[PDB]
Design a protein around this ligand. Structure first.
Ligand code: CL
Ligand code: CL
Lengths: 102, 102
């Protein structure tokens, strides 16, 4: 990367936005998010992703539920009403920058 | 803002992108960048801007020159060839995120 500082900041923002995008659409597990973000070309690990999930919930933008399904306890995340509003604002900001410089 | 953490990260990235965009197009003084970024709705001060200019130059993406014009010494910044290449990569990253989530 010619500009690793841009890429680092932008990637943090991108990851956050992708998480909200996916969690608004359906319930998601962290394990699946790691794979889906990776598919899209974002370098993430459970070690980096789970703390961002937890922070998103602390921010009120996700809510999680522990479920026991098929004998295994797992945590699923979904967007809250505040998270859907955030998703709209975050996307708007992205759309504006894209319109301005491209 | 519903998501201040997204807005903080995204704005740092946006400002960096704008700086390269302006410095590729012309030579710039810091004082003018402050005004131009402010016009566009970015909250920037000399305290935030000058350190990012310095880091951009350290990264080889900008070069600055102290220049005496009309009897007054000022520092001007412009993009280097590496900075122009970075601008292209940063734009590509923006384009990709726009495709993914919009
Ligand atoms: Cl760096
Ligand atoms: Cl978890």
């Amino acid at each position: 990367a010619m500009d690793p500082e841009f890429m680092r900041e932008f990637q943090r923002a991108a990851v956050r936005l992708h998480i909200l995008h996916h969690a608004a659409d359906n319930e998601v597990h962290g394990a699946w998010l790691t794979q889906e973000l990776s598919r899209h070309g974002y370098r993430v690990s459970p070690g980096t992703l789970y703390p961002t999930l937890h922070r998103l919930e602390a921010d009120g933008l996700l809510v999680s539920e522990q479920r026991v399904v098929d004998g295994r306890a797992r945590r699923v995340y979904r967007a809250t009403p505040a998270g859907r509003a955030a998703l709209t604002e975050d996307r708007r900001a992205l759309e504006e920058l894209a319109r301005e410089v491209l």
